[PDB]
Design a protein around this ligand. Sequence first.
Ligand SMILES: *[C@@H]1O[C@H](CO)[C@@H](O[C@@H]2O[C@H](CO)[C@@H](O[C@@H]3O[C@H](CO)[C@@H](O)[C@H](O)[C@@H]3O)[C@H](O)[C@H]2NC(C)=O)[C@H](O)[C@H]1NC(C)=O
Ligand SMILES: *[C@@H]1O[C@H](CO)[C@@H](O[C@@H]2O[C@H](CO)[C@@H](O[C@@H]3O[C@H](CO)[C@@H](O)[C@H](O)[C@@H]3O)[C@H](O)[C@H]2NC(C)=O)[C@H](O)[C@H]1NC(C)=O
Ligand SMILES: *[C@@H]1O[C@H](CO)[C@@H](O[C@@H]2O[C@H](CO)[C@@H](O[C@@H]3O[C@H](CO)[C@@H](O)[C@H](O)[C@@H]3O)[C@H](O)[C@H]2NC(C)=O)[C@H](O)[C@H]1NC(C)=O
Ligand SMILES: *[C@@H]1O[C@H](CO)[C@@H](O[C@@H]2O[C@H](CO)[C@@H](O)[C@H](O)[C@H]2NC(C)=O)[C@H](O)[C@H]1NC(C)=O
Lengths: 174, 174, 174, 54
Amino acid sequence: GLFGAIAGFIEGGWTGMIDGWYGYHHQNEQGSGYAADQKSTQNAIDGITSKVNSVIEKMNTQFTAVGKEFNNLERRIENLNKKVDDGFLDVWTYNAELLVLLENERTLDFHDSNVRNLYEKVKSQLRNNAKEIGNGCFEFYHKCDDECMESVKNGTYDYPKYSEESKLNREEID
Amino acid sequence: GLFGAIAGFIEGGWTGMIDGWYGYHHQNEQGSGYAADQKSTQNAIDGITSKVNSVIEKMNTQFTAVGKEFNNLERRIENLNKKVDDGFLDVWTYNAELLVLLENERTLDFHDSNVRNLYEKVKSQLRNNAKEIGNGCFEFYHKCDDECMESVKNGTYDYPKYSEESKLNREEID
Amino acid sequence: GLFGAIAGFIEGGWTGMIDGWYGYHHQNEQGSGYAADQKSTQNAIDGITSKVNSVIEKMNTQFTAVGKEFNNLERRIENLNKKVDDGFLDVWTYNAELLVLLENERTLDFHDSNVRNLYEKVKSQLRNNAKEIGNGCFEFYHKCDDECMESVKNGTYDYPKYSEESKLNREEID
Amino acid sequence: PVHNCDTRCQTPHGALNSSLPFQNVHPITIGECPKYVKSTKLRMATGLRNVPSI
Ligand SMILES: *[C@@H]1O[C@H](CO)[C@@H](O[C@@H]2O[C@H](CO)[C@@H](O[C@@H]3O[C@H](CO)[C@@H](O)[C@H](O)[C@@H]3O)[C@H](O)[C@H]2NC(C)=O)[C@H](O)[C@H]1NC(C)=O
Ligand SMILES: *[C@@H]1O[C@H](CO)[C@@H](O[C@@H]2O[C@H](CO)[C@@H](O[C@@H]3O[C@H](CO)[C@@H](O)[C@H](O)[C@@H]3O)[C@H](O)[C@H]2NC(C)=O)[C@H](O)[C@H]1NC(C)=O
Ligand SMILES: *[C@@H]1O[C@H](CO)[C@@H](O[C@@H]2O[C@H](CO)[C@@H](O[C@@H]3O[C@H](CO)[C@@H](O)[C@H](O)[C@@H]3O)[C@H](O)[C@H]2NC(C)=O)[C@H](O)[C@H]1NC(C)=O
Ligand SMILES: *[C@@H]1O[C@H](CO)[C@@H](O[C@@H]2O[C@H](CO)[C@@H](O)[C@H](O)[C@H]2NC(C)=O)[C@H](O)[C@H]1NC(C)=O
């Protein structure tokens, strides 16, 4: 089913982001953002590549298939031949169309799941000092620079370095 | 998979609700509830209608299929004919039953996803002033009337109108 | 899609747990843990058993299929016979491989969903007095013994028994 | 060679005693036999990803 991220609680995509599928957008003391997340997008590329190659290699190529000939006293066999060809053609066209239609919902839900998990990870490693504000943004009670940005990105945040100082600012706003 | 809402953290359904699939139940100063959510249920109706029409239009109708006749020296061709008919019949009955069995889990998980997303939306636009209490209910520290009920329903809540007053009552209970 | 629990926010599995698929690990005043959750694992066993039996009973057994013979002036019918046999064989081998490949993602996502729901239940019945710490662990501001352990396990926690006392300890740490 | 056991399925390579739905030996069968396919492995998962701890 729909996991709720793409065109969900997160609004439309980012045109300005180029080198990936899933990324961040940061505004510390000296810049704006648009950096991609090269870890998760590589797993997505691997999954999709394996999927397409699997769908290609399940379908065998056909060899030579040439029509046959019958005279006017072999109408019965000729109708049988036509029945066999039309039956197999209907079966294969059904299989092809149905396979593509199901595979498309599978892949769109796969991307949706990736975005939701990439959001939950960032939320989980910023437990207290964040104050999420809407459509997947956070806001750092403490002060952050480029190093803590990369520290968030990699997945190594070390929360107890900042845990006291944030607390002060939180009690300032409350 | 199972998204966890229907017969999950939310208990059984509402018999008293009529005009939709997903709705609300409110108890402000002057009434009880059971109003439907006409936005999401319309998307569900559109999806299911397109699904059923797609499943109908993938199956081609058959034209005239009449049995054939053979004498006592054409047993070999007769067995071949019977083999062709039984083979195609087995293939089509397999495809029909398997298509229905997979489509049923797909549609039940689709409804389950819709209920979970409709819960997450209401939670997200009532960040501080709610105090959720169980099986998908909220409880408004501030005071609400019919206008803020519709304000929740449409998706236009304007939280900073109430954000201070709620805070007072919250500190009363703590 | 991937629900995010198995090899996600929860790390690798437990070798020391034997009698189930989903379970707990508790450290009260007088012991360590590894007790299974016999309610949810039974539903998983029922679902998987029904799935395998359904996949078995959709495939009909075949009866006797013996090759035929043709002389040197019936090459045309012989090629037709070979075409019929090879066509049906290709159709069935396609159906078998494709059915197994889709069923495998279905079952792995089913297990992943079960783990996520089993986590959300425990979180929901420990609303205030828990302080979750990472990879699916909680930590009880109040004091717990074996009886409140089973009280958590069954799904009967009665939070207002402890709600005041926990509060005291919480304000001690803050 | 010919021996004198008792089966319910027979191929020109020998007999079969199984209840699995698919079959891989030979396409010419006598009796009531599982269906012949042209594959090598149809293992089906009933369980979790085996993720050992570190
Ligand atoms: C993920 O991000 C962390 C940053 O938190 C990376 O660790 C960092 O590695 C860089 C290398 O440029 C360090 O910067 C420089 O280190 C050298 C050597 O000590 C120093 O001379 C420079 O002045 C500068 O500090 C950076 O300090 C270090 N992290 C820390 C503790 O700040 C890490 O490599 C990235 N990758 C992973 C998977 O962690
Ligand atoms: C979603 O709900 C909002 C309510 O928050 C709807 O906006 C509201 O439109 C109604 C129309 O009946 C307003 O009520 C009346 O407006 C007239 C004209 O100003 C006034 O004379 C009446 O005394 C009464 O106020 C209502 O005031 C207005 N919302 C506000 C600001 O209270 C909205 O149309 C609904 N639909 C959407 C998609 O927003
Ligand atoms: C789920 O767990 C609860 C525990 O919260 C189970 O209820 C408990 O049943 C046990 C039976 O051993 C009670 O323990 C003993 O009860 C006897 C009879 O009163 C008493 O003489 C013993 O001294 C001891 O207390 C236990 O007290 C009781 N729960 C309470 C209120 O503590 C329950 O049966 C389990 N199953 C379900 C589905 O609830
Ligand atoms: C086919 O194989 C099955 C399973 O091995 C046999 O069934 C059981 O075999 C064991 C070992 O010989 C016996 O102890 C059981 O009593 C059998 N169970 C049944 C079904 O009664 C089965 O006998 C084999 N059939 C042949 C003819 O070899």
